[PDB]
Amino acid sequence: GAMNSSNYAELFNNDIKLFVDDTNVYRVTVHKTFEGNVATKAINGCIFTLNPKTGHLFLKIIHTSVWAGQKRLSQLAKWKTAEEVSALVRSLPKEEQPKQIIVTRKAMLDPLEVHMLDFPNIAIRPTELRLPFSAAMSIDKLSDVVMKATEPQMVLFNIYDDWLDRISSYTAFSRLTLLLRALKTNEESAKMILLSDPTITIKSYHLWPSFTDEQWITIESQMRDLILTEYGRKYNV
Amino acid sequence: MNTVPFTSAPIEVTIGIDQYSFNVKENQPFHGIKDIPIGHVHVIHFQHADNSSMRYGYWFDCRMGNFYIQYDPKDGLYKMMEERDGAKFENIVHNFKERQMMVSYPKIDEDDTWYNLTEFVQMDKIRKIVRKDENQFSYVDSSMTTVQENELSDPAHSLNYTVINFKSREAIRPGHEMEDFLDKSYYLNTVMLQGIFKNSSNYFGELQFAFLNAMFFGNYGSSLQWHAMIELICSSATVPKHMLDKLDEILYYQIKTLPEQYSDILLNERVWNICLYSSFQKNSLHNTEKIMENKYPELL
Ligand SMILES: COc1cc(CN2[C@@H](c3ccnc(OC)c3)N[C@@H](c3ccnc(OC)c3)[C@@H]2c2ccnc(OC)c2)ccn1
């Protein structure tokens, strides 16, 4: 059924699974035309396909060329997402194919079920969790790779860096969701907290700074404060 | 001109003949139904007074043999039987008619309702959906499951309706996933019409039979089938103009005939709202849209 706070530990068991977030696939800038009408200009997007156990992020870059001469782009974006996820599964050896794919938005269920008819044993699941994967494009290196792409590409990142050498998947996923929740709520504040101390760098192939365990504790605390700081404003609570 | 005699009526029962029904009392001197119109299939149906969890009946065509009803006190139901001896049968019917122990099939001359509900329904097709090849008539009841329902459990007692599944390899061509899912024309026209049914008449026949089994027996699987065959047409951008026009007439008479108080359980809100207001054919079913809006505006 649906993934929720009740069945949360399932994400970290030994059944291969992927989360699929499609919220950055179809991206536009809205602008005025010379005649004072409004038009959109598509910019490059991405599919966020994450193994929450290993941290493997299959970032499929969606180049604006996909959209050329197509209608109903917000509908097509769901089907292109399902097409690319099904292509990714087909590309993997049997023993690496997921047993479940969890979609962050219910509108992805039918497109993905239909594209995955050839895989009746792969469970396509929604979730009641409000995951902050939409903020993926606030991670500088992910944003950079997407915006620079001149053709369809698909880059594999480890969104946990080398955290799994020191912490469990459960803990790494909690850290990732706190960072993304922070970036989503107030990107400027979040980025300031992460990049304030120039002595702490980001490794060439990492996404996040090389915090010591004790420095992660301070960072995680500052991220919580930010999410509360901003929450007492949204709701005047 | 076409009589179904009854041996007797030992148990109190509501008897239906097509869209008509009457009450028979325990041991009432009732010896059957006369003046049944030749040229159509018919259904004789039963609901015992003592147990309404017992709703069942027989599809038959009087052109295919001499049929009678006789209560079986062992199996506890009214059973259809064929009399092979023409003269014993003629002698039984003549006697019961002389003693006026039969009800008359009470057709209004102006009234084409039964023709309109059974136009494409053929006994030969009924006998493929309901398999019991040793009889010329077909038993259906409220509890009988469809082959499709049996997939998701006695095959001999099943309704063999054509399996329709929108999220199936049958319905979706590789490389046309979004196209075939959003516009079901391929599935309707190539897979179902050209491939399985051969023609729109056989498709309409199964649609009409499913509706009638839903209405007369509250057969749930039949209701699912009727809605699936509507939805497949309404979800197809490319349908022959003759098929849309005929579908509008078919559905009009089915909505007209449906008891007012059963709309809640026999009509699927989602399918009808999609078919009349969102689908490719939202502007193609004028008669159906008008009777639905005037008879069941709550559902919509
Ligand atoms: C299809 O995957 C890729 C990946 C890259 C290149 N990545 C990177 C990546 C990271 C940061 N910026 C990038 O800006 C394009 C790309 N992810 C790497 C990675 C990390 C961990 N586990 C990994 O796998 C288990 C992979 C990998 C890489 C490249 C160069 N040096 C590396 O190690 C010294 C690692 C380039 C092209 N395609």
Coordinates of C-alpha atoms and ligand atoms in Angstrom, one line a residue:
Chain A
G1 CA 0.0 0.0 0.0
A2 CA 1.1 3.6 0.8
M3 CA 4.4 4.4 2.4
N4 CA 3.8 6.4 5.7
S5 CA 5.4 7.2 9.2
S6 CA 4.0 3.7 10.3
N7 CA 6.0 1.7 7.7
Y8 CA 9.1 4.0 7.6
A9 CA 11.9 1.4 8.5
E10 CA 10.9 -0.5 5.3
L11 CA 13.0 2.1 3.4
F12 CA 16.2 0.8 5.0
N13 CA 15.7 -3.0 4.7
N14 CA 17.4 -5.2 2.0
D15 CA 14.6 -5.0 -0.6
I16 CA 15.9 -2.7 -3.4
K17 CA 13.6 0.3 -3.8
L18 CA 13.7 3.7 -5.4
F19 CA 11.9 6.9 -4.7
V20 CA 10.9 8.8 -7.9
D21 CA 10.2 12.5 -7.6
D22 CA 9.0 14.3 -10.8
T23 CA 8.6 17.9 -9.4
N24 CA 11.7 19.2 -11.3
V25 CA 11.1 17.4 -14.7
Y26 CA 9.1 20.2 -16.4
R27 CA 10.5 23.6 -15.4
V28 CA 9.6 27.1 -16.8
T29 CA 10.2 30.8 -16.5
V30 CA 7.0 32.8 -16.9
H31 CA 7.6 36.1 -18.8
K32 CA 5.8 39.0 -20.7
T33 CA 5.8 39.1 -24.5
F34 CA 6.3 42.3 -26.5
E35 CA 2.5 42.5 -27.0
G36 CA 2.0 42.3 -23.2
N37 CA 0.8 38.6 -23.2
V38 CA 2.4 35.9 -21.0
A39 CA 4.5 33.0 -22.3
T40 CA 6.7 30.3 -20.7
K41 CA 10.3 29.4 -21.5
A42 CA 11.2 25.8 -20.5
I43 CA 14.5 25.3 -18.8
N44 CA 16.3 22.0 -18.2
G45 CA 14.9 19.7 -15.6
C46 CA 15.6 16.4 -13.9
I47 CA 14.1 13.2 -12.6
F48 CA 15.1 12.6 -8.9
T49 CA 15.4 8.8 -8.6
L50 CA 16.9 7.8 -5.2
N51 CA 17.8 4.5 -3.5
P52 CA 17.3 5.6 0.1
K53 CA 19.4 2.6 1.4
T54 CA 22.7 3.3 -0.7
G55 CA 22.2 7.0 -1.5
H56 CA 22.5 6.3 -5.2
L57 CA 20.7 9.2 -7.1
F58 CA 20.1 8.4 -10.8
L59 CA 19.7 12.0 -11.9
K60 CA 18.1 11.9 -15.4
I61 CA 18.6 15.3 -16.9
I62 CA 15.6 16.5 -19.0
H63 CA 16.8 18.7 -21.8
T64 CA 14.3 21.4 -23.1
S65 CA 14.5 19.7 -26.5
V66 CA 12.2 16.9 -25.1
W67 CA 9.3 19.5 -25.0
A68 CA 9.8 20.7 -28.6
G69 CA 6.4 20.6 -30.6
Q70 CA 4.6 18.8 -27.7
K71 CA 1.3 19.8 -26.2
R72 CA 0.0 19.4 -22.5
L73 CA 3.6 19.5 -21.2
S74 CA 2.6 19.0 -17.5
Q75 CA 0.8 15.8 -18.5
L76 CA 3.6 14.7 -20.9
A77 CA 6.2 15.3 -18.0
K78 CA 4.6 12.5 -16.0
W79 CA 4.7 10.0 -18.9
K80 CA 8.3 11.0 -19.8
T81 CA 9.3 10.5 -16.2
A82 CA 7.6 7.0 -16.3
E83 CA 9.3 6.2 -19.7
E84 CA 12.9 7.2 -18.3
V85 CA 12.3 5.2 -15.0
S86 CA 11.2 2.1 -16.9
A87 CA 14.2 2.5 -19.3
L88 CA 16.5 2.8 -16.2
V89 CA 15.0 -0.4 -14.6
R90 CA 15.3 -2.3 -18.0
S91 CA 19.0 -1.1 -18.2
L92 CA 19.9 -2.7 -14.8
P93 CA 20.7 -6.4 -14.3
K94 CA 17.8 -8.4 -12.7
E95 CA 19.5 -8.5 -9.3
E96 CA 19.8 -4.7 -9.2
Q97 CA 16.2 -4.0 -10.4
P98 CA 14.0 -2.5 -7.6
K99 CA 11.2 -4.6 -5.9
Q100 CA 9.3 -1.4 -5.3
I101 CA 9.2 2.2 -6.8
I102 CA 7.7 4.8 -4.4
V103 CA 6.4 7.9 -6.2
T104 CA 6.3 11.2 -4.3
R105 CA 3.2 12.4 -6.2
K106 CA 0.0 10.2 -6.8
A107 CA -0.3 11.6 -10.4
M108 CA 2.8 9.4 -11.2
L109 CA 1.1 6.1 -10.3
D110 CA -0.8 5.3 -13.6
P111 CA 2.0 6.6 -15.9
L112 CA 4.5 4.4 -14.1
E113 CA 2.2 1.3 -13.7
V114 CA 1.5 1.5 -17.5
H115 CA 5.3 1.9 -18.4
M116 CA 6.2 -1.0 -16.0
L117 CA 3.6 -3.6 -17.3
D118 CA 6.6 -5.8 -18.4
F119 CA 7.5 -5.9 -14.6
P120 CA 4.4 -7.2 -12.8
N121 CA 6.5 -8.1 -9.6
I122 CA 7.7 -4.5 -9.2
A123 CA 5.3 -2.7 -6.7
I124 CA 4.4 0.9 -7.6
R125 CA 3.5 2.7 -4.4
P126 CA 2.5 6.2 -3.3
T127 CA 3.5 7.8 0.0
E128 CA 1.7 9.9 2.6
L129 CA 5.2 11.4 3.5
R130 CA 5.7 15.1 2.4
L131 CA 9.3 14.6 1.2
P132 CA 11.3 17.7 0.3
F133 CA 12.9 16.2 -2.9
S134 CA 11.5 19.3 -4.9
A135 CA 14.5 21.2 -3.2
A136 CA 17.0 19.0 -5.1
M137 CA 17.8 21.9 -7.5
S138 CA 19.0 24.0 -4.4
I139 CA 22.0 21.6 -4.2
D140 CA 24.6 23.6 -6.2
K141 CA 26.3 20.7 -8.1
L142 CA 22.9 19.1 -9.1
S143 CA 21.6 22.5 -10.3
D144 CA 24.9 23.1 -12.2
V145 CA 24.9 19.7 -14.0
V146 CA 21.2 20.2 -15.1
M147 CA 21.6 23.8 -16.3
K148 CA 24.8 23.1 -18.3
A149 CA 23.4 20.0 -20.1
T150 CA 23.1 20.5 -23.9
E151 CA 21.5 17.0 -24.5
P152 CA 19.8 14.3 -22.5
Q153 CA 22.2 12.9 -19.8
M154 CA 21.9 10.8 -16.7
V155 CA 24.5 11.3 -13.9
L156 CA 24.8 9.0 -10.9
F157 CA 25.4 10.9 -7.6
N158 CA 25.9 9.6 -4.0
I159 CA 23.6 12.1 -2.2
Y160 CA 25.0 10.7 1.1
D161 CA 28.7 11.4 0.1
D162 CA 30.7 9.0 2.4
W163 CA 28.2 9.4 5.4
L164 CA 27.5 5.6 5.2
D165 CA 31.1 4.9 6.4
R166 CA 30.0 6.4 9.8
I167 CA 26.1 6.3 10.1
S168 CA 23.2 4.0 9.1
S169 CA 21.0 4.6 6.0
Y170 CA 18.1 5.6 8.4
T171 CA 20.3 8.3 9.9
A172 CA 21.7 9.4 6.5
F173 CA 18.1 9.7 5.1
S174 CA 17.1 11.7 8.1
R175 CA 20.1 14.1 7.6
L176 CA 19.3 14.4 3.8
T177 CA 15.5 15.1 4.5
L178 CA 16.4 17.8 7.2
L179 CA 18.9 19.5 4.7
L180 CA 16.4 19.5 1.9
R181 CA 13.5 20.6 4.2
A182 CA 15.8 23.5 5.3
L183 CA 16.8 24.4 1.7
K184 CA 13.0 24.3 0.6
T185 CA 11.8 26.6 3.5
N186 CA 14.6 29.2 3.2
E187 CA 17.3 28.4 0.6
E188 CA 19.5 31.5 1.4
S189 CA 19.6 30.8 5.2
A190 CA 20.2 27.0 4.6
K191 CA 23.1 27.7 2.2
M192 CA 24.6 30.3 4.6
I193 CA 24.6 27.7 7.4
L194 CA 26.2 25.0 5.2
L195 CA 29.0 27.3 3.6
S196 CA 29.7 29.8 6.5
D197 CA 33.1 28.3 7.6
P198 CA 35.4 28.3 4.5
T199 CA 37.8 25.8 6.2
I200 CA 35.2 23.0 5.7
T201 CA 35.2 22.2 2.0
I202 CA 33.1 20.0 -0.4
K203 CA 35.1 17.1 -1.9
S204 CA 35.2 17.2 -5.8
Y205 CA 32.7 14.2 -6.1
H206 CA 30.7 15.1 -2.9
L207 CA 27.5 17.3 -2.8
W208 CA 27.9 18.5 0.9
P209 CA 30.7 19.8 3.1
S210 CA 33.2 17.4 4.9
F211 CA 31.7 18.0 8.4
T212 CA 33.2 16.1 11.3
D213 CA 30.5 14.1 13.4
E214 CA 30.4 17.0 16.0
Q215 CA 30.1 19.7 13.2
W216 CA 27.2 17.7 11.7
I217 CA 25.5 18.0 15.1
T218 CA 25.8 21.8 15.1
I219 CA 24.7 22.0 11.4
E220 CA 21.7 19.7 12.0
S221 CA 20.7 21.9 15.1
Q222 CA 21.1 25.1 13.0
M223 CA 18.9 23.5 10.2
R224 CA 16.1 22.7 12.8
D225 CA 16.2 26.3 14.3
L226 CA 15.8 27.7 10.7
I227 CA 12.8 25.5 10.0
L228 CA 11.2 26.7 13.3
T229 CA 12.4 30.4 12.7
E230 CA 10.6 30.3 9.3
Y231 CA 7.6 28.3 10.6
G232 CA 6.8 31.2 13.1
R233 CA 6.0 33.6 10.1
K234 CA 4.2 31.4 7.6
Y235 CA 1.4 30.8 10.3
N236 CA 2.1 33.8 12.7
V237 CA 2.3 31.1 15.5
Chain B
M1 CA -47.2 -18.4 -30.4
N2 CA -44.6 -19.3 -27.7
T3 CA -45.5 -20.5 -24.2
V4 CA -43.4 -21.5 -21.2
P5 CA -45.7 -23.8 -19.1
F6 CA -45.0 -24.4 -15.4
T7 CA -45.7 -27.8 -13.9
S8 CA -46.7 -26.0 -10.7
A9 CA -45.8 -23.2 -8.2
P10 CA -45.2 -25.0 -4.9
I11 CA -43.3 -22.1 -3.3
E12 CA -44.3 -18.4 -3.1
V13 CA -42.1 -16.5 -5.6
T14 CA -41.9 -13.2 -7.6
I15 CA -41.6 -14.3 -11.3
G16 CA -40.1 -12.0 -13.9
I17 CA -40.4 -12.3 -17.6
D18 CA -38.1 -9.7 -19.3
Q19 CA -39.0 -6.3 -17.8
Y20 CA -42.4 -7.6 -16.3
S21 CA -43.0 -9.3 -12.9
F22 CA -45.8 -10.8 -10.9
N23 CA -46.3 -12.5 -7.5
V24 CA -47.3 -16.2 -7.2
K25 CA -48.6 -17.5 -3.9
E26 CA -47.5 -20.9 -2.4
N27 CA -49.5 -23.6 -4.3
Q28 CA -51.3 -20.9 -6.4
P29 CA -52.7 -22.6 -9.6
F30 CA -50.2 -21.0 -11.9
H31 CA -49.2 -22.9 -15.1
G32 CA -47.0 -20.4 -16.9
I33 CA -46.6 -17.6 -19.4
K34 CA -48.1 -17.5 -22.9
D35 CA -48.0 -15.0 -25.9
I36 CA -44.2 -14.6 -25.6
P37 CA -43.0 -12.7 -28.6
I38 CA -40.9 -14.7 -31.1
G39 CA -37.8 -13.1 -32.5
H40 CA -36.1 -12.0 -29.3
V41 CA -34.2 -13.7 -26.5
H42 CA -36.1 -13.7 -23.2
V43 CA -35.3 -14.1 -19.5
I44 CA -37.6 -15.7 -16.9
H45 CA -36.4 -14.9 -13.4
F46 CA -37.2 -15.8 -9.8
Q47 CA -37.0 -14.3 -6.3
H48 CA -38.4 -16.5 -3.5
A49 CA -40.6 -14.7 -0.9
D50 CA -38.9 -16.7 1.9
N51 CA -35.3 -15.8 0.9
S52 CA -34.5 -12.8 -1.5
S53 CA -30.8 -14.2 -1.3
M54 CA -32.0 -16.5 -4.2
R55 CA -32.3 -14.3 -7.4
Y56 CA -31.8 -16.4 -10.5
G57 CA -33.2 -17.1 -14.0
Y58 CA -32.9 -18.5 -17.5
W59 CA -32.1 -16.9 -20.8
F60 CA -33.9 -18.7 -23.6
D61 CA -35.2 -18.3 -27.2
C62 CA -38.5 -20.3 -27.9
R63 CA -37.3 -20.8 -31.5
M64 CA -34.6 -23.2 -30.2
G65 CA -37.0 -25.7 -28.4
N66 CA -40.0 -26.3 -26.1
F67 CA -39.1 -25.1 -22.6
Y68 CA -41.0 -25.5 -19.3
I69 CA -40.4 -24.6 -15.6
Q70 CA -40.7 -27.2 -12.9
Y71 CA -39.8 -26.7 -9.2
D72 CA -37.2 -29.2 -7.9
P73 CA -37.9 -29.7 -4.2
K74 CA -34.3 -31.2 -3.7
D75 CA -32.3 -28.2 -5.2
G76 CA -35.0 -25.8 -4.0
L77 CA -35.5 -23.9 -7.2
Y78 CA -37.6 -23.4 -10.3
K79 CA -35.7 -25.2 -13.1
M80 CA -36.0 -24.7 -16.9
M81 CA -36.2 -28.0 -18.8
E82 CA -36.6 -28.9 -22.5
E83 CA -39.5 -31.1 -23.6
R84 CA -38.3 -33.1 -26.7
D85 CA -41.8 -34.7 -27.3
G86 CA -43.5 -32.0 -29.4
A87 CA -47.0 -33.5 -29.0
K88 CA -46.9 -34.0 -25.1
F89 CA -45.8 -30.3 -25.0
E90 CA -48.6 -29.0 -27.4
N91 CA -51.1 -31.1 -25.3
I92 CA -49.8 -29.6 -22.0
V93 CA -49.9 -26.0 -23.3
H94 CA -53.4 -26.4 -25.0
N95 CA -54.9 -27.8 -21.7
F96 CA -53.4 -25.0 -19.5
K97 CA -54.5 -22.2 -21.9
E98 CA -58.1 -23.7 -22.1
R99 CA -58.3 -23.6 -18.2
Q100 CA -56.7 -20.0 -18.4
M101 CA -54.0 -20.9 -15.8
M102 CA -51.4 -18.8 -17.7
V103 CA -50.4 -15.1 -17.5
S104 CA -50.0 -13.3 -20.9
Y105 CA -46.7 -11.6 -21.8
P106 CA -48.2 -8.2 -21.4
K107 CA -46.6 -6.3 -24.3
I108 CA -48.0 -2.8 -25.2
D109 CA -48.2 -2.7 -29.0
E110 CA -46.4 0.8 -29.2
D111 CA -43.7 -0.4 -26.8
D112 CA -40.3 -1.4 -28.3
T113 CA -38.5 -1.5 -24.8
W114 CA -37.5 -5.2 -24.9
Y115 CA -36.3 -5.0 -28.6
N116 CA -34.3 -1.8 -27.7
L117 CA -32.7 -3.6 -24.7
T118 CA -31.9 -6.9 -26.6
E119 CA -31.3 -5.6 -30.2
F120 CA -27.8 -7.2 -30.5
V121 CA -28.3 -10.0 -27.9
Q122 CA -28.1 -13.5 -29.5
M123 CA -28.7 -16.8 -27.7
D124 CA -25.6 -18.3 -29.4
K125 CA -23.4 -15.5 -27.8
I126 CA -25.2 -15.9 -24.4
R127 CA -24.2 -19.7 -24.5
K128 CA -20.5 -18.8 -24.9
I129 CA -20.6 -16.4 -21.9
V130 CA -22.6 -18.9 -19.8
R131 CA -21.2 -22.4 -20.6
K132 CA -23.5 -25.4 -20.1
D133 CA -23.6 -26.8 -23.7
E134 CA -26.1 -29.7 -22.8
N135 CA -28.9 -27.1 -22.4
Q136 CA -30.3 -24.6 -25.0
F137 CA -31.1 -22.1 -22.2
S138 CA -28.7 -20.3 -19.8
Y139 CA -28.9 -20.1 -16.0
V140 CA -27.6 -16.8 -14.4
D141 CA -27.9 -15.7 -10.7
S142 CA -26.9 -12.8 -8.4
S143 CA -23.7 -14.5 -7.0
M144 CA -22.1 -15.8 -10.2
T145 CA -18.6 -14.3 -10.7
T146 CA -16.9 -13.3 -13.9
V147 CA -13.7 -14.9 -15.3
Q148 CA -12.1 -11.4 -14.7
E149 CA -13.3 -11.4 -11.0
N150 CA -12.0 -15.0 -10.7
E151 CA -8.4 -13.8 -11.7
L152 CA -8.4 -11.1 -8.9
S153 CA -13.6 -19.6 -8.0
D154 CA -15.5 -22.5 -9.8
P155 CA -14.9 -22.1 -13.6
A156 CA -18.1 -24.2 -14.6
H157 CA -20.4 -21.6 -12.8
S158 CA -18.7 -18.4 -14.2
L159 CA -19.7 -15.5 -16.5
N160 CA -17.2 -15.7 -19.5
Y161 CA -17.4 -12.0 -20.4
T162 CA -14.6 -10.7 -22.6
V163 CA -11.7 -9.5 -20.3
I164 CA -11.2 -5.7 -20.5
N165 CA -8.3 -4.2 -18.5
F166 CA -7.1 -0.6 -19.3
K167 CA -3.7 -1.4 -17.6
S168 CA -2.8 -4.6 -19.4
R169 CA -0.3 -5.4 -22.2
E170 CA -3.5 -6.2 -24.3
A171 CA -4.6 -2.6 -24.0
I172 CA -1.1 -0.9 -24.3
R173 CA 1.3 -1.2 -27.3
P174 CA 5.0 -1.0 -26.3
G175 CA 6.2 2.6 -27.2
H176 CA 2.6 4.0 -27.3
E177 CA 2.1 3.9 -23.5
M178 CA 0.7 7.5 -23.0
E179 CA -1.0 7.4 -26.4
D180 CA -2.9 4.1 -25.9
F181 CA -3.7 4.9 -22.2
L182 CA -5.2 8.4 -22.8
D183 CA -6.8 7.5 -26.2
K184 CA -8.1 3.9 -26.2
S185 CA -9.0 3.8 -30.0
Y186 CA -6.3 1.1 -30.7
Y187 CA -7.7 -1.2 -27.9
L188 CA -11.4 -0.6 -29.0
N189 CA -11.0 -0.8 -32.8
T190 CA -8.0 -3.2 -33.4
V191 CA -7.9 -5.5 -30.3
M192 CA -11.6 -5.7 -29.4
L193 CA -13.7 -4.9 -32.5
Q194 CA -11.5 -6.3 -35.3
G195 CA -9.7 -9.0 -33.1
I196 CA -12.1 -10.5 -30.5
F197 CA -15.7 -9.4 -31.2
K198 CA -15.3 -9.2 -35.1
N199 CA -18.0 -6.5 -35.4
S200 CA -19.8 -3.8 -33.3
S201 CA -23.1 -5.9 -33.1
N202 CA -21.3 -8.7 -31.0
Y203 CA -19.7 -5.9 -28.8
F204 CA -23.1 -4.3 -28.2
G205 CA -24.7 -7.8 -27.6
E206 CA -22.2 -8.4 -24.7
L207 CA -22.7 -4.9 -23.4
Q208 CA -26.5 -5.3 -23.5
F209 CA -26.4 -8.8 -21.9
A210 CA -24.0 -7.5 -19.1
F211 CA -26.5 -4.6 -18.3
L212 CA -29.5 -7.0 -18.2
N213 CA -27.7 -9.4 -15.8
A214 CA -26.8 -6.4 -13.6
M215 CA -30.4 -5.1 -13.6
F216 CA -32.3 -8.4 -13.3
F217 CA -30.0 -10.3 -10.9
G218 CA -27.9 -7.4 -9.2
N219 CA -24.9 -9.4 -10.6
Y220 CA -22.0 -7.2 -9.6
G221 CA -19.5 -8.6 -12.1
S222 CA -22.0 -7.9 -14.9
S223 CA -22.3 -4.3 -13.8
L224 CA -18.4 -3.9 -13.9
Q225 CA -18.5 -5.4 -17.4
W226 CA -21.3 -3.1 -18.7
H227 CA -19.4 0.0 -17.3
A228 CA -16.0 -1.2 -18.8
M229 CA -17.5 -1.6 -22.3
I230 CA -19.1 1.9 -22.1
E231 CA -15.8 3.4 -20.8
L232 CA -13.7 1.8 -23.5
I233 CA -15.9 3.5 -26.2
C234 CA -16.1 6.9 -24.3
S235 CA -12.3 6.9 -23.8
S236 CA -11.6 6.3 -27.6
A237 CA -11.1 9.5 -29.7
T238 CA -11.8 7.4 -32.9
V239 CA -15.1 5.5 -33.0
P240 CA -17.3 4.8 -36.1
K241 CA -20.2 7.5 -36.2
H242 CA -22.7 4.6 -36.5
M243 CA -21.3 3.0 -33.3
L244 CA -21.7 6.3 -31.3
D245 CA -25.2 6.8 -32.6
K246 CA -26.2 3.2 -31.7
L247 CA -24.4 3.5 -28.2
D248 CA -26.5 6.6 -27.4
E249 CA -29.7 4.7 -28.3
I250 CA -28.6 1.6 -26.3
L251 CA -27.7 3.5 -23.1
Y252 CA -30.8 5.7 -23.4
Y253 CA -33.1 2.6 -23.1
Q254 CA -31.0 1.1 -20.4
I255 CA -31.1 4.3 -18.3
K256 CA -34.9 4.6 -19.1
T257 CA -35.6 1.0 -17.8
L258 CA -33.4 1.1 -14.7
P259 CA -35.6 1.2 -11.5
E260 CA -35.3 4.8 -10.1
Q261 CA -34.3 3.5 -6.6
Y262 CA -31.3 1.3 -7.8
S263 CA -29.3 4.1 -9.6
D264 CA -27.2 4.4 -6.3
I265 CA -25.8 0.7 -6.6
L266 CA -26.1 0.1 -10.5
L267 CA -24.5 3.3 -11.8
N268 CA -20.8 4.1 -11.4
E269 CA -20.5 7.9 -10.7
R270 CA -16.8 8.0 -12.0
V271 CA -17.6 6.3 -15.4
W272 CA -20.8 8.3 -16.1
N273 CA -19.2 11.7 -15.1
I274 CA -16.1 10.8 -17.3
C275 CA -18.2 9.5 -20.2
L276 CA -20.7 12.4 -20.3
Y277 CA -18.5 15.4 -19.3
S278 CA -14.7 14.7 -19.6
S279 CA -14.3 11.9 -22.3
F280 CA -13.7 12.2 -26.1
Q281 CA -17.4 11.3 -26.6
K282 CA -18.7 13.9 -24.0
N283 CA -20.7 15.6 -26.9
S284 CA -21.7 12.4 -28.8
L285 CA -24.4 10.9 -26.4
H286 CA -27.1 13.6 -26.5
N287 CA -30.0 11.2 -25.7
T288 CA -28.2 9.5 -22.8
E289 CA -26.9 12.8 -21.4
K290 CA -30.5 14.3 -21.5
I291 CA -32.2 11.3 -19.8
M292 CA -29.3 11.0 -17.2
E293 CA -29.4 14.8 -16.4
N294 CA -33.3 14.6 -16.0
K295 CA -33.5 11.2 -14.2
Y296 CA -30.3 11.0 -12.0
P297 CA -28.8 14.6 -11.6
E298 CA -27.6 13.7 -8.0
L299 CA -25.3 11.0 -9.4
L300 CA -23.7 13.6 -11.7
Ligands
LIG1 C1 26.7 8.3 -14.9 O1 27.4 8.8 -13.8 C2 28.3 9.8 -13.9 C3 29.0 10.3 -12.8 C4 29.9 11.3 -13.1 C5 30.8 11.8 -12.0 N1 30.4 11.3 -10.7 C6 30.1 12.3 -9.7 C7 29.6 13.7 -9.7 C8 29.8 14.3 -8.5 C9 29.9 15.7 -8.4 N2 29.9 16.5 -9.5 C10 29.6 15.9 -10.7 O2 29.5 16.7 -11.7 C11 29.2 16.1 -13.0 C12 29.5 14.5 -10.8 N3 29.4 11.4 -8.8 C13 30.5 10.5 -8.6 C14 30.2 9.3 -7.7 C15 30.3 9.5 -6.3 C16 30.1 8.4 -5.5 N4 29.7 7.2 -5.9 C17 29.5 7.1 -7.3 O3 29.1 5.9 -7.7 C18 28.9 4.9 -6.8 C19 29.7 8.1 -8.2 C20 31.2 10.3 -10.0 C21 32.7 10.5 -10.0 C22 33.3 11.3 -11.0 C23 34.6 11.7 -10.8 N5 35.3 11.5 -9.7 C24 34.7 10.7 -8.8 O4 35.5 10.3 -7.7 C25 36.8 10.8 -7.6 C26 33.4 10.2 -8.9 C27 30.0 11.8 -14.3 C28 29.2 11.2 -15.3 N6 28.4 10.2 -15.1

